Amino acid sequence: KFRVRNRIKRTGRLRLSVFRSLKHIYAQIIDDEKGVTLVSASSLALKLKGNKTEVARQVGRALAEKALALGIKQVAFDRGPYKYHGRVKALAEGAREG
Amino acid sequence: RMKYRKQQRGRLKGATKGGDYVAFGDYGLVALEPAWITAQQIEAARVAMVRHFRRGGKIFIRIFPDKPYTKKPLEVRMGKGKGNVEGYVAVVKPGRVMFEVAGVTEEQAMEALRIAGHKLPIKTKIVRRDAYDEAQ
Amino acid sequence: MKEGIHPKLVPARIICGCGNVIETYSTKPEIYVEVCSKCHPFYTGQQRF
Amino acid sequence: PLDVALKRKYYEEVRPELIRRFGYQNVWEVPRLEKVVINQGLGEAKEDARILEKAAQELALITGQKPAVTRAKKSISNFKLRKGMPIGLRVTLRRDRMWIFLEKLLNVALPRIRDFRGLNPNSFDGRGNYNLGLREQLIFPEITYDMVDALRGMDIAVVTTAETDEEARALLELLGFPFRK
Amino acid sequence: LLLECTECKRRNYATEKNKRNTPNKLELRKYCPWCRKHTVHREV
RNA sequence: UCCCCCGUGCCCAUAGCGGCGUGGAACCACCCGUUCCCAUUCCGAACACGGAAGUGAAACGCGCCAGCGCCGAUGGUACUGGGCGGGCGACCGCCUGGGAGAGUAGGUCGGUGCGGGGG
RNA sequence: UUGACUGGGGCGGUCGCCUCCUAAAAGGUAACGGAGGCGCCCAAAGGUCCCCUCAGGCGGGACGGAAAUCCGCCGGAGAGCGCAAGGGUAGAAGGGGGCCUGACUGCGAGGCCUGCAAGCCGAGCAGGGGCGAAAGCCGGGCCUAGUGAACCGGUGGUCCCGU
RNA sequence: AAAAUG
RNA sequence: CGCGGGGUGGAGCAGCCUGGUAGCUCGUCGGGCUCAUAACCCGAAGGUCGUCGGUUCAAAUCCGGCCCCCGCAACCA
């Protein structure tokens, strides 16, 4: 089993919980200490193309505008099994860096 | 016959554990006063027990020494006693059932235990059964 | 499946009849019968009759 | 060198007889096959400049991958070598590389094994999957006699996606696994 | 061993502590000097 | 509104183990491949990328079961702030407030916010 | 000049520090009361990023004990955590790998403990760095023992003094 | 100028 | 009661604080010399290292528990 929880090591509020399926990637901005979610940007549960990586971006841009819209910026990335690689949000806007 | 030992005297308060119930056997020997019973005593009783009815039934000794009884050599003061020397003992709080017999007549059984009591440094009482259990 | 670690392939695979003369494929000792059989005591008395 | 009979046959020949023989429903509820682990123990890495990364690759040839030098988990004064380092070579053939090796095994090695009568049908004994150990290292088509500088066989394990040794036993009796009933 | 690190071509000390026989000798490593910022600091 | 499912948090075993049928349209997974990214002390097993033919067998989801596990009263005592008698002593007892632990009856194969995709 | 403690003194034992217990559920708490350690060690046994998860038990396996190394289930911790014990811990403090050297310099809010003087924790600011995409973490080590005021000198260094 | 007993 | 020395093949002594190699003399055993015995000569064997366990990869060896063996003290009233 993977006890990953690479997260849990999230203390500076605002979590960009991702989630790669086997076709669609979902990202989600969440507030801890007070369990609730705000910004969201799925893969095909949205629409756009059929190419993972390619999509993985236009799917992140999504969070950008969407988020910035309601006054969001500085945050920390996320997703544990994640393995910072292919899946990506390498995009402007959010000051989550990376 | 084990563990790290030469322990603290400690004391015997109320006999909140002085009062079980015949577990096996048929008749029994329950204690009335609290005390430390030297193994020397147990045997000295048990023996006379069996010995009272040569080639008889079964004897059950629920009490069991494990507490080390220390003692000084006949001098003054300087660290705990040589300890043990004489040996170990078991702690009996008024009510505990020490010995219990079975497989024999009450005339034989009852009279058997009576003797034991003389060996023990306490005051005893003899019991039958039919009492406690967990049935319905 | 990585760097100068592995070794090769080519035909060291489905090269079926790769000269069974190497020693023996599913040739002999098919796990059946070979030389003679048993000796048999008594059941074999050629002394007389 | 991509697809081999054994593999082939397994599909267009074994599956059926099995689907029937036993009687399944979902091709996955079937008796798949997926892992072979030829492992050695050797004996040591003790004195006299004992490199023994020789039979290391000797093993590679007989297979395809490079084995993993195994190390001590404990330390035993009884018979030398303790604490770490030492040796206990191992390798894991999966898919392709696996099929072939077996096919090469079940048609040249075992044959020829010293004498040979079959295999032990008790080695599974029930618990899904098999096992067996070969004494000689030169009982392989790739390796030679003027090559091996010292005997030292080993043991190989094999894994079934099936449970009951019954199944497992059938799957191999079909794949050509001989059996000293 | 009571060691200290002498920034090559100057002063300063770090006051470390090696283990000699236990693989040592030639101790030196990027430390921060007081005379401007870093150098490496040797042994001695 | 009420269903189904993919992410997530909270309560932190009454959600556990083990059984028993079900779910593939969606989702999810397993699968299809190893050219590229990157991979395993040897293995694309795991990480990873590219694809979607086949499957619900694995795994996960959802239900039912009490055999194991977990929970668990009420009563009643043990012990006990405080106060107080009897006896030479060893010890026994009352008044006034608190009050288990075991064991019994019995309970339980979850509960609950947030955001999503589908009828 | 030839110490003190000490159920008289001598003889014997001891003399500082760590950990359980005694200790009576905050701390603290005696006795020549019960029971064990320390006067070191790591240049990786330290930083950070990324991975992995134990011990056992049960089968199955060439040499092969009753654990050498393999494969398969079961096993939430009984292993591990340099050395005593204890507390803590796998949702890692454990096992492995890549880069590193913060085992930094200037400081230090606010506290713990406390007769004194000592001991302990420490966010944050500055400088100039490490690892990570990043959020971030880094002033030695899972933590508590591994230590000694002053005086007198020794080696260096430097803005100072120098009859 | 020479290495015990039965 | 307390200190401290010591238990190793059959006898008598090493080896132990500096853990992995058990050494010496005597005697036991086999073969020679001699008419024969000694002597002398050549060649072998033989040790759970007192015990019950602890630490270690490994204990004759280091740390505790008794069992016999040996010595030294046990003083003022």
Short mmCIF file of N, CA, C and O in Angstrom, two decimals, chain D residues 36-141:
data_model
loop_
_atom_site.label_atom_id
_atom_site.label_comp_id
_atom_site.label_asym_id
_atom_site.label_seq_id
_atom_site.Cartn_x
_atom_site.Cartn_y
_atom_site.Cartn_z
N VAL D 36 8.61 -15.74 -13.16
CA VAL D 36 9.60 -16.79 -12.94
C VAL D 36 10.80 -16.15 -12.26
O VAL D 36 11.31 -15.13 -12.74
N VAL D 37 11.24 -16.74 -11.16
CA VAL D 37 12.37 -16.17 -10.44
C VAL D 37 13.52 -17.13 -10.20
O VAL D 37 13.61 -17.78 -9.16
N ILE D 38 14.42 -17.22 -11.17
CA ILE D 38 15.55 -18.09 -11.01
C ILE D 38 16.45 -17.38 -9.99
O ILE D 38 16.88 -16.25 -10.20
N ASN D 39 16.68 -18.04 -8.86
CA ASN D 39 17.54 -17.47 -7.81
C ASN D 39 18.63 -18.46 -7.44
O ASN D 39 18.41 -19.67 -7.48
N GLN D 40 19.80 -17.95 -7.07
CA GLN D 40 20.92 -18.79 -6.65
C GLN D 40 21.22 -18.48 -5.18
O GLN D 40 20.70 -17.51 -4.63
N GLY D 41 22.05 -19.31 -4.56
CA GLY D 41 22.43 -19.10 -3.17
C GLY D 41 23.94 -19.09 -3.12
O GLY D 41 24.57 -18.41 -2.30
N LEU D 42 24.53 -19.86 -4.03
CA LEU D 42 25.97 -19.96 -4.15
C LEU D 42 26.57 -20.69 -2.96
O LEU D 42 26.56 -21.92 -2.89
N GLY D 43 27.11 -19.90 -2.04
CA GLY D 43 27.73 -20.47 -0.86
C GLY D 43 28.48 -19.40 -0.11
O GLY D 43 28.47 -19.38 1.12
N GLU D 44 29.12 -18.49 -0.84
CA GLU D 44 29.86 -17.44 -0.17
C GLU D 44 30.46 -16.36 -1.05
O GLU D 44 30.12 -16.20 -2.22
N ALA D 45 31.38 -15.62 -0.42
CA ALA D 45 32.13 -14.53 -1.02
C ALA D 45 33.35 -14.43 -0.11
O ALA D 45 34.07 -13.43 -0.10
N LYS D 46 33.56 -15.50 0.65
CA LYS D 46 34.65 -15.63 1.61
C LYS D 46 36.05 -15.40 1.06
O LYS D 46 36.22 -14.77 0.01
N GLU D 47 37.06 -15.92 1.76
CA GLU D 47 38.46 -15.73 1.39
C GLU D 47 39.00 -16.32 0.08
O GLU D 47 38.36 -17.17 -0.55
N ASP D 48 40.20 -15.85 -0.29
CA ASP D 48 40.93 -16.25 -1.50
C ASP D 48 40.54 -15.44 -2.73
O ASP D 48 40.61 -15.93 -3.86
N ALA D 49 40.14 -14.19 -2.51
CA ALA D 49 39.73 -13.30 -3.60
C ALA D 49 38.47 -13.83 -4.28
O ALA D 49 38.40 -13.89 -5.51
N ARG D 50 37.47 -14.21 -3.47
CA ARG D 50 36.21 -14.74 -3.99
C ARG D 50 35.33 -13.64 -4.57
O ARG D 50 34.51 -13.04 -3.87
N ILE D 51 35.50 -13.39 -5.86
CA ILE D 51 34.72 -12.38 -6.57
C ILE D 51 33.33 -12.96 -6.77
O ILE D 51 32.34 -12.43 -6.28
N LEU D 52 33.29 -14.07 -7.51
CA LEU D 52 32.04 -14.76 -7.83
C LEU D 52 30.92 -13.84 -8.31
O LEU D 52 29.80 -13.79 -7.76
N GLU D 53 31.29 -13.08 -9.33
CA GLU D 53 30.41 -12.19 -10.03
C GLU D 53 30.65 -12.81 -11.40
O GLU D 53 30.42 -12.20 -12.45
N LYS D 54 31.13 -14.04 -11.33
CA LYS D 54 31.42 -14.85 -12.49
C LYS D 54 30.12 -15.58 -12.79
O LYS D 54 29.43 -15.25 -13.76
N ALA D 55 29.77 -16.54 -11.95
CA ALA D 55 28.53 -17.28 -12.13
C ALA D 55 27.41 -16.26 -12.13
O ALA D 55 26.24 -16.59 -12.35
N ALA D 56 27.78 -15.01 -11.85
CA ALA D 56 26.82 -13.93 -11.82
C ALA D 56 26.21 -13.88 -13.20
O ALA D 56 25.05 -14.24 -13.39
N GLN D 57 27.03 -13.44 -14.17
CA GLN D 57 26.61 -13.30 -15.56
C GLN D 57 26.44 -14.64 -16.27
O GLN D 57 25.74 -14.74 -17.28
N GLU D 58 27.08 -15.66 -15.72
CA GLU D 58 26.95 -17.01 -16.27
C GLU D 58 25.45 -17.25 -16.25
O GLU D 58 24.86 -17.81 -17.17
N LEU D 59 24.85 -16.76 -15.17
CA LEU D 59 23.43 -16.89 -14.95
C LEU D 59 22.67 -16.06 -15.96
O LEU D 59 21.65 -16.48 -16.49
N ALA D 60 23.19 -14.87 -16.22
CA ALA D 60 22.56 -13.95 -17.17
C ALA D 60 22.34 -14.61 -18.51
O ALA D 60 21.25 -14.56 -19.07
N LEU D 61 23.39 -15.24 -19.01
CA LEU D 61 23.27 -15.88 -20.30
C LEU D 61 22.15 -16.88 -20.29
O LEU D 61 21.29 -16.84 -21.17
N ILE D 62 22.15 -17.76 -19.30
CA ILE D 62 21.12 -18.79 -19.23
C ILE D 62 19.72 -18.18 -19.20
O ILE D 62 18.72 -18.89 -19.42
N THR D 63 19.65 -16.87 -18.96
CA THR D 63 18.36 -16.17 -18.86
C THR D 63 18.12 -14.99 -19.81
O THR D 63 17.44 -15.13 -20.83
N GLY D 64 18.65 -13.82 -19.45
CA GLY D 64 18.47 -12.62 -20.25
C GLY D 64 18.73 -11.34 -19.47
O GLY D 64 19.30 -10.37 -19.98
N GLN D 65 18.30 -11.32 -18.21
CA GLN D 65 18.51 -10.16 -17.36
C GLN D 65 19.79 -10.36 -16.58
O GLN D 65 20.48 -11.37 -16.73
N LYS D 66 20.10 -9.37 -15.75
CA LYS D 66 21.29 -9.40 -14.92
C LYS D 66 20.69 -9.68 -13.57
O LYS D 66 19.64 -9.12 -13.22
N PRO D 67 21.30 -10.59 -12.80
CA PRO D 67 20.73 -10.86 -11.48
C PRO D 67 21.12 -9.77 -10.49
O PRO D 67 21.98 -8.93 -10.77
N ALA D 68 20.46 -9.75 -9.34
CA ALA D 68 20.76 -8.76 -8.32
C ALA D 68 21.61 -9.41 -7.23
O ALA D 68 21.21 -10.41 -6.63
N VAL D 69 22.79 -8.86 -6.99
CA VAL D 69 23.64 -9.42 -5.96
C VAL D 69 22.84 -9.28 -4.69
O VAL D 69 22.46 -8.17 -4.33
N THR D 70 22.55 -10.40 -4.03
CA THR D 70 21.78 -10.35 -2.79
C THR D 70 22.68 -10.21 -1.57
O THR D 70 23.81 -10.68 -1.58
N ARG D 71 22.19 -9.56 -0.52
CA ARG D 71 23.01 -9.39 0.67
C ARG D 71 22.42 -9.97 1.96
O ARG D 71 21.22 -10.25 2.05
N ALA D 72 23.29 -10.16 2.95
CA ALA D 72 22.86 -10.70 4.24
C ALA D 72 21.91 -9.77 5.00
O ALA D 72 22.11 -8.54 5.04
N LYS D 73 20.87 -10.35 5.60
CA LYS D 73 19.88 -9.61 6.37
C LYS D 73 20.26 -9.67 7.84
O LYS D 73 19.95 -8.78 8.63
N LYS D 74 20.93 -10.76 8.20
CA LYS D 74 21.40 -10.97 9.56
C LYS D 74 22.87 -11.35 9.55
O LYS D 74 23.57 -11.16 8.55
N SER D 75 23.33 -11.89 10.66
CA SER D 75 24.71 -12.31 10.80
C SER D 75 24.74 -13.61 11.58
O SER D 75 24.15 -13.69 12.66
N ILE D 76 25.40 -14.63 11.04
CA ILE D 76 25.46 -15.90 11.74
C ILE D 76 26.90 -16.35 11.93
O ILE D 76 27.63 -16.59 10.97
N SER D 77 27.31 -16.46 13.19
CA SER D 77 28.67 -16.88 13.50
C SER D 77 28.86 -18.35 13.17
O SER D 77 29.97 -18.77 12.82
N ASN D 78 27.80 -19.13 13.30
CA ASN D 78 27.87 -20.55 13.01
C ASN D 78 28.68 -20.80 11.75
O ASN D 78 29.77 -21.36 11.83
N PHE D 79 28.16 -20.42 10.59
CA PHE D 79 28.96 -20.60 9.39
C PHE D 79 29.27 -19.25 8.76
O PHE D 79 28.44 -18.65 8.09
N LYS D 80 30.49 -18.80 9.04
CA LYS D 80 31.06 -17.54 8.59
C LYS D 80 30.07 -16.46 8.18
O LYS D 80 28.98 -16.36 8.74
N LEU D 81 30.50 -15.63 7.22
CA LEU D 81 29.71 -14.52 6.69
C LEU D 81 28.56 -14.02 7.56
O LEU D 81 27.61 -14.74 7.86
N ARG D 82 28.68 -12.74 7.94
CA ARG D 82 27.70 -12.10 8.80
C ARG D 82 27.41 -10.67 8.36
O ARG D 82 27.96 -10.17 7.38
N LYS D 83 26.50 -10.04 9.10
CA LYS D 83 26.10 -8.64 8.94
C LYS D 83 25.63 -8.10 7.59
O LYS D 83 24.45 -7.82 7.43
N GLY D 84 26.54 -7.91 6.64
CA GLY D 84 26.10 -7.41 5.35
C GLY D 84 26.64 -8.13 4.13
O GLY D 84 26.68 -9.36 4.04
N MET D 85 27.03 -7.33 3.15
CA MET D 85 27.61 -7.80 1.91
C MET D 85 27.35 -9.22 1.37
O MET D 85 26.27 -9.50 0.85
N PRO D 86 28.31 -10.15 1.55
CA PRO D 86 28.07 -11.48 1.02
C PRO D 86 27.36 -11.57 -0.33
O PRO D 86 27.44 -10.64 -1.13
N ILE D 87 26.72 -12.71 -0.59
CA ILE D 87 26.02 -12.91 -1.86
C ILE D 87 24.85 -13.89 -1.78
O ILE D 87 24.78 -14.73 -0.89
N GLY D 88 23.94 -13.73 -2.75
CA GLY D 88 22.76 -14.57 -2.86
C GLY D 88 21.97 -14.20 -4.11
O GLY D 88 20.77 -13.99 -4.04
N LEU D 89 22.65 -14.14 -5.25
CA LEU D 89 22.05 -13.79 -6.55
C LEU D 89 20.61 -14.16 -6.85
O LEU D 89 20.16 -15.25 -6.50
N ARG D 90 19.91 -13.26 -7.53
CA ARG D 90 18.50 -13.45 -7.91
C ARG D 90 18.09 -12.67 -9.15
O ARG D 90 18.67 -11.63 -9.45
N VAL D 91 17.07 -13.16 -9.86
CA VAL D 91 16.58 -12.48 -11.06
C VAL D 91 15.10 -12.74 -11.33
O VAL D 91 14.58 -13.82 -11.05
N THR D 92 14.43 -11.74 -11.90
CA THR D 92 13.01 -11.86 -12.18
C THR D 92 12.60 -11.69 -13.64
O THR D 92 12.57 -10.57 -14.18
N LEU D 93 12.26 -12.79 -14.29
CA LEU D 93 11.86 -12.73 -15.68
C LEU D 93 10.36 -12.57 -15.66
O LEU D 93 9.65 -13.27 -14.93
N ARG D 94 9.88 -11.60 -16.42
CA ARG D 94 8.45 -11.33 -16.52
C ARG D 94 8.15 -11.43 -18.00
O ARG D 94 9.07 -11.43 -18.81
N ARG D 95 6.87 -11.49 -18.36
CA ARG D 95 6.49 -11.57 -19.76
C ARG D 95 7.57 -12.23 -20.65
O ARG D 95 8.35 -13.07 -20.19
N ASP D 96 7.58 -11.84 -21.93
CA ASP D 96 8.51 -12.34 -22.93
C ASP D 96 9.70 -13.13 -22.41
O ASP D 96 9.68 -14.37 -22.38
N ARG D 97 10.75 -12.41 -22.01
CA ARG D 97 11.98 -13.01 -21.49
C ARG D 97 11.67 -14.29 -20.73
O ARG D 97 12.40 -15.28 -20.83
N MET D 98 10.58 -14.25 -19.97
CA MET D 98 10.13 -15.39 -19.18
C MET D 98 9.71 -16.55 -20.08
O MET D 98 10.33 -17.61 -20.09
N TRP D 99 8.64 -16.34 -20.84
CA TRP D 99 8.14 -17.39 -21.71
C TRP D 99 9.29 -18.17 -22.32
O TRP D 99 9.51 -19.34 -21.99
N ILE D 100 10.03 -17.50 -23.20
CA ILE D 100 11.14 -18.13 -23.87
C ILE D 100 11.97 -19.01 -22.94
O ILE D 100 12.00 -20.23 -23.11
N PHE D 101 12.65 -18.41 -21.95
CA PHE D 101 13.45 -19.18 -20.99
C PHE D 101 12.79 -20.51 -20.63
O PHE D 101 13.41 -21.57 -20.77
N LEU D 102 11.55 -20.46 -20.17
CA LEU D 102 10.82 -21.67 -19.83
C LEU D 102 10.88 -22.61 -21.01
O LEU D 102 11.38 -23.74 -20.90
N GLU D 103 10.38 -22.14 -22.15
CA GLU D 103 10.37 -22.94 -23.37
C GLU D 103 11.73 -23.58 -23.60
O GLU D 103 11.80 -24.74 -24.02
N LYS D 104 12.80 -22.84 -23.33
CA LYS D 104 14.15 -23.38 -23.51
C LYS D 104 14.41 -24.41 -22.42
O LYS D 104 15.10 -25.40 -22.64
N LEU D 105 13.85 -24.16 -21.24
CA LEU D 105 14.00 -25.06 -20.12
C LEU D 105 13.32 -26.37 -20.46
O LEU D 105 13.97 -27.41 -20.60
N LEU D 106 12.00 -26.30 -20.62
CA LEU D 106 11.17 -27.45 -20.91
C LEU D 106 11.40 -28.19 -22.23
O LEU D 106 10.52 -28.91 -22.69
N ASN D 107 12.58 -28.02 -22.85
CA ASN D 107 12.87 -28.69 -24.12
C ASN D 107 14.35 -28.99 -24.33
O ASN D 107 14.74 -29.49 -25.38
N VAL D 108 15.17 -28.67 -23.33
CA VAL D 108 16.61 -28.89 -23.44
C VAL D 108 17.26 -29.14 -22.08
O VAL D 108 17.99 -30.12 -21.89
N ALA D 109 17.00 -28.25 -21.13
CA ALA D 109 17.56 -28.37 -19.79
C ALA D 109 17.12 -29.68 -19.13
O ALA D 109 17.82 -30.69 -19.22
N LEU D 110 15.96 -29.64 -18.49
CA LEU D 110 15.39 -30.81 -17.82
C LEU D 110 15.72 -32.17 -18.44
O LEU D 110 16.16 -33.08 -17.74
N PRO D 111 15.51 -32.32 -19.76
CA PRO D 111 15.78 -33.57 -20.47
C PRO D 111 16.86 -34.45 -19.86
O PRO D 111 16.82 -35.67 -19.99
N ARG D 112 19.64 -31.69 -20.72
CA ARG D 112 19.23 -32.91 -20.04
C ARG D 112 19.68 -32.98 -18.58
O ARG D 112 20.87 -32.92 -18.29
N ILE D 113 18.72 -33.12 -17.67
CA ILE D 113 19.05 -33.20 -16.25
C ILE D 113 19.60 -34.57 -15.85
O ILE D 113 18.87 -35.55 -15.84
N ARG D 114 20.90 -34.62 -15.53
CA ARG D 114 21.56 -35.85 -15.11
C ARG D 114 20.84 -37.08 -15.66
O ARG D 114 21.16 -37.57 -16.74
N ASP D 115 19.85 -37.55 -14.89
CA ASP D 115 19.04 -38.71 -15.26
C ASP D 115 17.62 -38.28 -15.66
O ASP D 115 17.24 -38.37 -16.83
N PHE D 116 16.85 -37.83 -14.67
CA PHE D 116 15.49 -37.33 -14.86
C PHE D 116 14.41 -38.40 -15.06
O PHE D 116 14.60 -39.34 -15.82
N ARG D 117 13.29 -38.22 -14.37
CA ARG D 117 12.14 -39.12 -14.45
C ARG D 117 10.87 -38.30 -14.61
O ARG D 117 9.87 -38.76 -15.16
N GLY D 118 10.93 -37.07 -14.10
CA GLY D 118 9.81 -36.15 -14.15
C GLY D 118 10.05 -35.02 -13.16
O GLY D 118 11.19 -34.61 -12.96
N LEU D 119 8.98 -34.53 -12.55
CA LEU D 119 9.08 -33.46 -11.56
C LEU D 119 8.31 -33.89 -10.33
O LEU D 119 7.61 -34.90 -10.36
N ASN D 120 8.42 -33.12 -9.25
CA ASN D 120 7.69 -33.49 -8.05
C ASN D 120 6.30 -32.85 -8.05
O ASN D 120 6.15 -31.64 -7.94
N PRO D 121 5.26 -33.67 -8.18
CA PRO D 121 3.91 -33.12 -8.18
C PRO D 121 3.50 -32.66 -6.79
O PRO D 121 2.39 -32.15 -6.61
N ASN D 122 4.39 -32.84 -5.81
CA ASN D 122 4.11 -32.44 -4.43
C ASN D 122 4.71 -31.08 -4.10
O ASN D 122 4.35 -30.46 -3.10
N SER D 123 5.63 -30.62 -4.95
CA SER D 123 6.29 -29.33 -4.75
C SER D 123 5.31 -28.15 -4.66
O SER D 123 5.64 -27.17 -4.00
N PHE D 124 4.15 -28.21 -5.31
CA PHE D 124 3.20 -27.10 -5.15
C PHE D 124 2.58 -27.42 -3.80
O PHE D 124 2.52 -26.58 -2.89
N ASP D 125 2.13 -28.67 -3.71
CA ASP D 125 1.49 -29.26 -2.54
C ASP D 125 0.10 -28.67 -2.28
O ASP D 125 -0.65 -29.18 -1.45
N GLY D 126 -0.23 -27.60 -3.01
CA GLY D 126 -1.52 -26.96 -2.85
C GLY D 126 -1.49 -25.45 -3.03
O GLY D 126 -2.21 -24.92 -3.88
N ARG D 127 -0.68 -24.77 -2.23
CA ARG D 127 -0.55 -23.32 -2.29
C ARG D 127 -0.20 -22.89 -3.71
O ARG D 127 0.87 -23.25 -4.22
N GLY D 128 -1.08 -22.12 -4.35
CA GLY D 128 -0.85 -21.66 -5.71
C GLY D 128 0.61 -21.37 -6.00
O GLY D 128 1.31 -20.87 -5.13
N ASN D 129 1.06 -21.68 -7.22
CA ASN D 129 2.45 -21.46 -7.65
C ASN D 129 3.35 -22.68 -7.45
O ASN D 129 3.00 -23.60 -6.70
N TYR D 130 4.51 -22.69 -8.11
CA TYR D 130 5.39 -23.85 -8.05
C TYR D 130 6.78 -23.59 -7.50
O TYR D 130 7.02 -22.56 -6.89
N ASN D 131 7.69 -24.54 -7.70
CA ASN D 131 9.06 -24.42 -7.21
C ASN D 131 9.92 -25.61 -7.60
O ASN D 131 9.42 -26.70 -7.83
N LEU D 132 11.23 -25.39 -7.65
CA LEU D 132 12.13 -26.47 -8.01
C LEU D 132 13.56 -25.96 -8.14
O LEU D 132 13.79 -24.80 -8.50
N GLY D 133 14.53 -26.83 -7.86
CA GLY D 133 15.92 -26.43 -7.93
C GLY D 133 16.79 -27.37 -8.74
O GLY D 133 16.73 -28.58 -8.59
N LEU D 134 17.62 -26.79 -9.59
CA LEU D 134 18.51 -27.56 -10.42
C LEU D 134 19.91 -27.51 -9.80
O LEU D 134 20.33 -26.48 -9.27
N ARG D 135 20.61 -28.63 -9.87
CA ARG D 135 21.95 -28.74 -9.31
C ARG D 135 23.00 -28.17 -10.26
O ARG D 135 23.79 -27.33 -9.87
N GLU D 136 23.00 -28.64 -11.50
CA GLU D 136 23.99 -28.18 -12.48
C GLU D 136 23.62 -26.88 -13.19
O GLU D 136 22.45 -26.61 -13.49
N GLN D 137 24.64 -26.06 -13.46
CA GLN D 137 24.47 -24.77 -14.12
C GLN D 137 24.71 -24.92 -15.62
O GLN D 137 24.31 -24.07 -16.42
N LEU D 138 25.37 -26.02 -15.99
CA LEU D 138 25.71 -26.31 -17.37
C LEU D 138 24.65 -27.13 -18.11
O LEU D 138 24.92 -27.67 -19.18
N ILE D 139 23.48 -27.25 -17.51
CA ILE D 139 22.38 -27.97 -18.13
C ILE D 139 21.56 -26.95 -18.90
O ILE D 139 20.33 -26.89 -18.80
N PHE D 140 22.26 -26.12 -19.66
CA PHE D 140 21.63 -25.10 -20.46
C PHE D 140 22.35 -24.93 -21.79
O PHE D 140 23.58 -24.81 -21.85
N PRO D 141 21.58 -24.89 -22.88
CA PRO D 141 22.05 -24.75 -24.26
C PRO D 141 23.05 -23.63 -24.52
O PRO D 141 23.98 -23.79 -25.31
#
